[PDB]
Design a protein around this nucleic acid. Sequence first.
RNA 1: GCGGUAGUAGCAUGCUAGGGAGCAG
RNA 2: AGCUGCUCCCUAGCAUGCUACUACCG
Lengths: 187, 186, 296, 72, 102
Amino acid sequence: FSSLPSYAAFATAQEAYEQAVANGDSEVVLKKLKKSLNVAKSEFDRDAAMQRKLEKMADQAMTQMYKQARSEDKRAKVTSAMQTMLFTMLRKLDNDALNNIINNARDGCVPLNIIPLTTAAKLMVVIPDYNTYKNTCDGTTFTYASALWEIQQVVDADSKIVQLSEISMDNSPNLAWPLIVTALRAN
Amino acid sequence: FSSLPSYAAFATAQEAYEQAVANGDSEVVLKKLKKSLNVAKSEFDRDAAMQRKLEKMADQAMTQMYKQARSEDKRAKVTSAMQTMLFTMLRKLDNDALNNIINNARDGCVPLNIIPLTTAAKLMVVIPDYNTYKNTCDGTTFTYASALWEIQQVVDADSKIVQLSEISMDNSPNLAWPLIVTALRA
Amino acid sequence: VGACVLCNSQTSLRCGACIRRPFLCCKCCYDHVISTSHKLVLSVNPYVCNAPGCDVTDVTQLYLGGMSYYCKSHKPPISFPLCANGQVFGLYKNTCVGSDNVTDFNAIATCDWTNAGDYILANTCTERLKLFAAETLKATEETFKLSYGIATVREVLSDRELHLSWEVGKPRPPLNRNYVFTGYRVTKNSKVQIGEYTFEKGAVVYRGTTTYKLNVGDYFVLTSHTVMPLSAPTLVPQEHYVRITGLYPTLNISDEFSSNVANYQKVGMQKYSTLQGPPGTGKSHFAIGLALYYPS
Amino acid sequence: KMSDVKCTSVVLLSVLQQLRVESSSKLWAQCVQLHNDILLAKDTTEAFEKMVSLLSVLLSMQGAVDINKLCE
Amino acid sequence: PYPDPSRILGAGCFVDDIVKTDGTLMIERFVSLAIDAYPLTKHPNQEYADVFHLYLQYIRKLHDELTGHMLDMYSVMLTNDNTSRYWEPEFYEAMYTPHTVL
RNA sequence: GCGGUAGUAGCAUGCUAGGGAGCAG
RNA sequence: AGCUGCUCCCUAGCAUGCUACUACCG
Ligand SMILES: [Zn+2]
Ligand SMILES: [Zn+2]
């Protein structure tokens, strides 16, 4: 504070007090001027020291308001993200096989573990070594889960394409050896 | 923190009181010196504390920013410090088998696969010229990594098998010299 | 962080508003920022007030507010001015010698490299400062060259002849053989790989790199590089050898290079060759002649 | 003498890892096996065997300038 | 209670970059590791108290190196230390005596 | 001369909060 | 990239409390 009502009173009080001190009139003049400048600094104390809690509290409030606004924007952002994800993953399951197996239930309830088994259009097989490959995904087509699948594309642990003519018993020690087969459901 | 202005005041009145305690004087002029020193030890005992704390505040801020700078600059040079440290430690280790392969790689003879430990398994090494072949190869034996191997085949850069007898000083400029020797451990 | 250019003392500050953000020491940077209009400095963190959505970017008005730098109306009860004493608060505030003559770097920074005195200072200044002037030249030309228009061809008139169309707000620069255009071919995903070409008025005549088909909608733009700082000066502090070092003369004399035998010794004992050679005086014949001075 | 070889093995595998070797599954598997076997050894005559084997991997690549780092 | 010495030494030797390999930037890591290893000084085996004494000596070395850097590069000195307590054993001994001062 | 209230400076205990780090299951 | 418990260091805030100095009054 520099331009509040107490300042003018205090300043003029001490100016007149010290002008009269330069005059040097009495002994009660000193007492009176010092009492005035004791009670006028008792005005510049409340008005210049406790006036400053108001500003600090207002700044507390302003920072809290800023924080609340930011926290309110983040919620809308994450809500939009979640509902976009839900709607984008919805656009793949609304097929005609799902409707079939749901209309074959007696209440509309089915176990979840059978939904990929009877409706998924693509299958992925992970093979550790050659004997397991020879027992499961042999040739161009194979049978699994009461269905028949046809192979397209084989990769290795480095994600590099392997041809079906390289997977032999002699060339086995030269392959990165988890193999990942991708197959499509045959009609 | 004596370089502050108010010190000159605090000494001044204190000096007066010194004279007072030397004089043995009346009662009121000592009230004078107990009313203009407690205003000095109050107008100064406030300036000489906040500044003293500010000095340490500046010091701690400078140390924090220096810590940040050095940590930022340390993780931008890992790929060179690590290799320098590795080769310093290898030099200090002082092993014959490691020194052999390090010096051979320094000259140009480098392997093409992992060096095997079993008495079986195949080794393939590159040979860039004839001097290394002469001080490394002798007949049908190969001295590498402080071990002895027997030669099985020599080739040149165009993947064409070369028999061992023709490799010599005069026939040297007739072969693609980056030779590739295949051997097996004794 | 490291040593500065003009001062060679370790520092941690930049001119934010200046061109190529050089290293500058406490008093060093203070002179550079108070003598001219660059009034934004970057320490390990930038010198801005973190007040939510505030504006100021000056250096002499922001203050210290504990952990961060704050604005005047934003600053806490008691502060410590960041820019006083003739220094800006930063690393290594003691070991800083500074400088008085700062008109050189100030002129080099505030200049636009448009007139003759620009290059007069660019050469006649300090060699490190002239390397900096070189990089400033490159940056200025890069920034001014992409500021021109984009060549959006829409027609197909002939081969080596087409029609040009350019956008609003950017003029079309001089279609000269001095500055090569650069184009990219459109597709649904990206647009890349037509090469560097040279256009001029015709109808628009184009000078193409290699024969291909001229599609529709391809843009031709004066693209820019990502120019990098320099390390070594223009040339080395020079020397005359006492011996023919790392070299030994030849044994014979060459017919086409008999006219330059007096030119063999004179530089074999120093680094540089200050050439005064007019176009077509055997300008390049010595490039193959002095080459076989010693084929090793 | 055993402590030195174990520390050198740790630093060597760090150098191999930052040269983008784990992009080849077989090579990374062999390097990991050798590094883990050196750290569990009890006699200092097989640790040097496996150290030769593991350093040959770095010597067979071309991402390090041997003549420059070995200025001595 | 006391720990296994190799656990303390291994914690001192192997880290995850920046977190060590530059001791002057953290220092408090070794203070905590010496708090954990103080009771080894009361073991009959003499190779066990050497761990605590090695940690104290390293703490002193780190403090000296940081101060030397700081004065050789700005000109700056920490005014009053209050840090010599970190390489004297009373600080670590007080953590195992029944009068809680947490 | 003492008590009270209003001020200014330093010290002590704990309580919340923010950041970095170590150990154990 | 997890759930807990314990400990060390630094900063800020508030309350409380201690102590000292100025002012008013009784
Ligand atoms: Zn500038
Ligand atoms: Zn602001």
